[PDB]
Amino acid sequence: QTPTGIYYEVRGDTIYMINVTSGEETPIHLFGVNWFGFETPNHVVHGLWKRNWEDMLLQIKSLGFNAIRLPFCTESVKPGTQPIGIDYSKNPDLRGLDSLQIMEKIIKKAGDLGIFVLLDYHRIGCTHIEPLWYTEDFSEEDFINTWIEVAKRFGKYWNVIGADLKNEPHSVTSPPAAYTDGTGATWGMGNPATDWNLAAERIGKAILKVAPHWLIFVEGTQFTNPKTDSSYKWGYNAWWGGNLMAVKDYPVNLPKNKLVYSPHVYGPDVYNQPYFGPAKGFPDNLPDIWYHHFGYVKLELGYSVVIGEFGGKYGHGGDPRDVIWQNKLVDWMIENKFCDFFYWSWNPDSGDTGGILQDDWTTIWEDKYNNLKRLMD
């Protein structure tokens, strides 16, 4: 049931790593970071114009992280795709390698450091996050076939825990139109061509056929269906990939022991949500909002919930409420035992969030990290 001898599964709401030969099981927690770049025109994780790739992984490990979420686009996982923006004096062992080979080298090195890797099909093109898992020139079959090829190749790396099926299903128009106009993802609306809960089953099933040992990470949508979204006062103000309110009545039809729900959640640096106003009760109003959008999926329904993205500038060149926001979110995660997450991002070159690293790609933001470090202990 595994090409590596290692099998990942959810027991209760906790992820376990199973050695199938010895029978040994260990619960694991994912203290993760997003290192992005393979999903961009660079076709490689960013920062290698300033840093050595291995030094980066060591620095990540040095801060107590044990997991990396690795966004990719279709092109980066095809042989022959050339990366742009590498300083080869700092990265001599990367000379001659295409994007796929660098991805392999990074995953293998991460594994050597005991770092788990989650593969994230972040973009179909390499420019922006499409609202759906297909485009006019790239069909759902093309999407699934790509995942199959990725699972065949990377399923052989022991430390790859699975597949984040599609980054941030979302809408590009407003409701109630968004539910039916076919431009955006839905959940429980009924049309299997827009319903992410149905698509996730189709894509997930295909992956589990070739990588039965993997977990399937399924993000939220932005809007689900009018009955669900209208059932809660802040039902129309969830993030892309962050609306899991339809899980209760419309659960994804996959084996529970292989499924992880993976919401994204953000603060005032990404969008000035009305509920970030003290006028609306910020920040003491946040736990109930998080609980409704996604928290109940673990606390009430007992599924594995892993926060796939969260982050913000933490008062460095952004909205100073972000400091309060990130502190409250970490407090809530600790209190409710959400111990699995991927911070967005390791990279500093994220326009609305910044990262763990500062713009010099070398020094970390001490305060931002100190808060996060609380989740690690």
Nearest to 167 by CA among 111, 113, 214, 122: 122
How many helices (H) and strands (E) would you count in the chain?
Answer: 9, 12
* Residue 329 to residues 52, 195, 243, 333, Cα–Cα distance (Å): 33, 29, 17, 6
Nearest to 129 by CA among 26, 227, 294, 264: 264
Helix axis angle, 366-376 to 321-335, nearest 10°: 10
What whole-number distance in Å separates Cα of residue 50 and Cα of residue 91?
10
Experimental method: X-ray
For residue 363, give both structure tokens.
């020094």
**Residues recognised as catalytic:** 168, 309
Residue 138 pairs with which residues in a beta bridge?
A: 135
Q: Binding site for Zn(2+): residue ranges?
A: 29, 43, 75, 168, 288, 292, 309, 316, 339-340, 367, 377
* Residue 88 to residues 37, 53, 85, 206, 325, Cα–Cα distance (Å): 17, 10, 9, 38, 39
- The three-state secondary structure class of 100 is helix
Q: Binding site: residue ranges?
A: 29, 43, 75, 168, 288, 292, 309, 316, 339-340, 367, 377
| Cβ atoms 309, 240 nearer than 8 A | no
Domains of the chain, CATH where assigned: 1-377 (3.20.20.80)
Breaks in the chain after residues (C–N exceeding 2.5 Å): none
